Write a protein that binds this DNA or RNA. Structure first.
Ligand SMILES: Nc1nc2c(ncn2[C@H]2C[C@H](O)[C@@H](COP(=O)(O)NP(=O)(O)OP(=O)(O)O)O2)c(=O)[nH]1
Ligand SMILES: [Mn+2]
Ligand SMILES: [Mn+2]
Length: 425
DNA sequence: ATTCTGACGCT
């Protein structure tokens, strides 16, 4: 009872941009705004592969991983923006720079952990404490939460439902107790409204957010009312929320591990995990995963918001599927050089912006007919930012995969160069 | 023949 800690010590938010690459293209090209539109990579094979879809286009069934030619069958009016092509490959620089715009705004409010090109976690515990002291017992008005949903409310038109649930929540709040976790989350949500307003004012981009006591619940909360809304998931909301939540929806369980939880335990929903002992879960899934699962299904997770805004690696990849696979020495060399030229550009800019240098070069390849996504992964020293040296070293390190007797066999279906092991500069 | 990333765990 009094000694079962409840994982209510922190206020954590997850901010995720709405259809991010589409919004970047819509800001640049006003003719795309408020239209069914998507962003593709390449164009020749089936019109290109879609990686981002506006919410208008999602209403017709357009999804990521769809070929644009197929999406047009669902949505004949679909508008398309193509990712930039440089040195014969997709170049995501525009979206990386847009990401930095957003991250720099979020960093004004609190320490953030970049979790992807378009999302960051925010540790708001200290900011909430400061703001609670600033309010000096003053209640929290619904006007301060104009885009917030309270998960699980109302209890007992979409905007009308939203506001009913918010009123129920706010009428229940104990504002005089500076230590109430529910009040702390509410103040967190006020700050996140301010952060999201700043992002939209200063970039034009809309985003959604989750506010809860840890990263997993904040990420889950984010997706519940996208787009352009934020969602507060309280500790008390967890039993009902998890009682029908498929296990695969929880971050890290969308893959083989979640499938094995489902199959070994004979369950479907996160909440059903509560019926197992910590030792039982550790027995099936290992000591780390088992402890994590035991706490997670009760709404509890301890993973910190890491102070890390910048990527830890800078990588350059290209697939060569089907008959396009690289089958000569000259081909492999030329593409390694293209990859290294983009890597050198991004690294030189990184070194000037972020006062750091990469020290290790990772080379990964796939060969045709190989089941694995990495037929080989080998590292070497990254001593200078020179594309010719990096491409020559990558070839030196992969060349003994060639079984030919000028030819390359098995043909390569993927090349990948990644700079890692950064040190201050 | 979604492709192009990037974090993190295991051994
Ligand atoms: N190259 C590449 N980029 C991708 C891929 N998947 C996503 N991206 C890029 C394009 C995406 O815009 C961006 C962020 O991915 P999300 O946050 O998962 N989706 P979004 O923000 O579009 O919509 P929502 O409102 O549902 O969050 O990452 C992929 O497989 N490949
Ligand atoms: Mn997003
Ligand atoms: Mn995202």
């Amino acid at each position: 009872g009094p000694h079962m800690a409840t994982g209510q010590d922190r206020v954590v938010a997850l901010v995720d941009m709405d259809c991010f690459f589409v919004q970047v293209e819509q800001r640049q090209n006003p003719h795309l705004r408020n239209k069914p539109c998507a962003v593709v990579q390449y164009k020749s094979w089936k019109g290109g592969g879609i990686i981002a879809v506006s919410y208008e286009a999602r209403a017709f069934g357009v999804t990521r991983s769809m070929w644009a030619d197929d999406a047009k069958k669902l949505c004949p009016d679909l508008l398309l923006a193509q990712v930039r092509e440089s040195r014969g490959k997709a170049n995501l620089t525009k979206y990386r720079e847009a990401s930095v715009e957003v991250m720099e705004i979020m960093s004004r409010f609190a320490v953030i952990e970049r979790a992807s090109i378009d999302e960051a976690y925010v540790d708001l515990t200290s900011a909430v404490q400061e703001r609670l002291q600033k309010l000096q017992g003053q209640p929290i008005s619904a006007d301060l939460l104009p885009s917030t949903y309270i998960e699980g409310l109302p209890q007992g038109q979409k905007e009308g439902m939203r506001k009913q649930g918010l009123f129920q929540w706010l009428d229940s709040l104990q504002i005089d107790n500076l230590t109430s976790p529910d009040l702390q989350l509410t103040v967190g949500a006020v700050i996140v409204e301010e952060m999201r307003a700043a992002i939209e004012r200063e970039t034009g981009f809309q985003c959604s957010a989750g506010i809860s006591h840890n990263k997993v619940l904040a990420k889950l909360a984010c997706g519940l009312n996208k787009p352009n809304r934020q969602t507060l998931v309280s500790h008390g909301s967890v039993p009902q929320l998890f009682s029908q939540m498929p296990i695969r929806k929880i971050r890290s369980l969308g893959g083989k591990l979640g499938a094995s939880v489902i199959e070994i335990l004979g369950i479907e929903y996160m909440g059903e995990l509560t019926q197992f002992t910590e030792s039982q879960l550790q027995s099936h899934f290992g000591e780390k995963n088992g402890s994590w699962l035991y706490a997670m299904c009760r709404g509890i997770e301890h993973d910190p918001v890491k102070p890390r805004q910048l990527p830890k690696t800078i990588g350059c990849s290209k697939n060569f599927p089907g008959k396009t696979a690289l089958a000569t020495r000259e081909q492999v060399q030329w593409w390694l050089l293209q990859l290294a030229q983009e890597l050198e550009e991004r690294l030189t800019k990184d070194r000037n912006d972020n006062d750091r240098v990469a020290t290790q070069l990772v080379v990964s390849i796939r060969v045709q007919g190989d089941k694995r996504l990495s037929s080989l992964r080998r590292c070497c020293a990254l001593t200078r930012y020179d594309a010719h040296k990096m491409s020559h070293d990558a070839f030196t390190v992969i060349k003994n995969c060639n079984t030919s007797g000028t030819e390359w066999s098995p043909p390569l279906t993927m090349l990948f160069l990644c700079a890692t092991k950064f040190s201050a500069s």
